[PDB]
Symmetry: C2
Subunit: 169 residues, 2 copies
């Protein structure tokens, strides 16, 4: 059953690869709580099917890196890219796409979060197994405020431009 507007965001454990010395952090993969991490923040989360894949890498992530300044000026606190990939892979992908300080690369490699959101899809035919649908959501007070989920294979609503255009008062 799919997550909806008005719903509380389900908790799950995600991992983020940390490349630099930071406090309360170790080097490499650091576990975190989705609910703990969105408490008291306004957060855009965009999920996508996989690190290192063409549309994800060429278009979807770069649009958010390029829009980060405008999203933050408009009051977004953090921007997360969530994928069903582990943190080592998300970390390498983040270093390739120069995401540091703009988009948190959030690994859901066990698909726990994507499952709790009801947003998985079966990409076995492509050698990818179970992965996320492509989407963007805006979270405030730990509640889903907007939700844009793409039909399989499409990229019409979850890109950073559409999101910036649909932030609301």
């Amino acid at each position: 059953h799919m997550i909806q507007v008005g719903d509380a965001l389900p908790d799950a454990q995600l991992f983020e690869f940390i490349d630099d010395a930071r406090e309360g952090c170790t080097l490499g993969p650091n576990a975190c709580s989705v609910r703990d991490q969105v408490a008291g923040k306004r957060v855009v989360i965009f999920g996508l099917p996989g690190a290192f894949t063409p549309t994800c890498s060429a278009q979807h992530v770069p649009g958010y890196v390029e829009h980060a300044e405008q999203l933050r000026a408009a009051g977004i606190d953090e921007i997360w890219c969530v994928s069903v990939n582990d943190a080592f892979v998300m970390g390498a992908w983040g270093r390739d796409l120069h995401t540091a300080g703009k988009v948190r690369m959030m690994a859901d490699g066990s698909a726990a979060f994507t499952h709790a959101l009801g947003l998985t899809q079966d990409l076995s035919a492509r050698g990818m197994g179970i992965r996320s649908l492509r989407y963007a959501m805006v979270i405030d007070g730990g509640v889903v405020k907007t939700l844009a989920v793409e039909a399989p294979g499409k990229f019409e609503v979850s890109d950073a431009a559409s999101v910036l255009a649909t932030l609301t008062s």
Copy 2:
């Protein structure tokens, strides 16, 4: 789900993908699907499986030992060396380029875990955010059959390294 493969067993078929970046006949650019049994037919093949692309022991030790030993393994009559992992081909492609595997170790994506499941060689690495992945192992295949099998206890790396495999090739 499946019982663990054993010495003497026929290798099960599965669909794997290898990322191919040069142009070559019969292939396209990027991920190419291929049949396990079709690709081992008439060859002598070392397959080592491991838990994940870009992870530390896999990256620093396990794959480089095979790149390093690839000339000796081929002199001993091995036709191909495959690295199998439960990762998709885009990730395996990028990893292989980072590790200079071209022409030495084929980076064989089992991103749906179909092959690893068919081998009975999966483990649950959820606690570290990796979900279902492969055990670490190495096997030598000849005539479509498992001739030797070395499966690691979880978190161990004492029998699937290239040195051990070279040492245990047989006449």
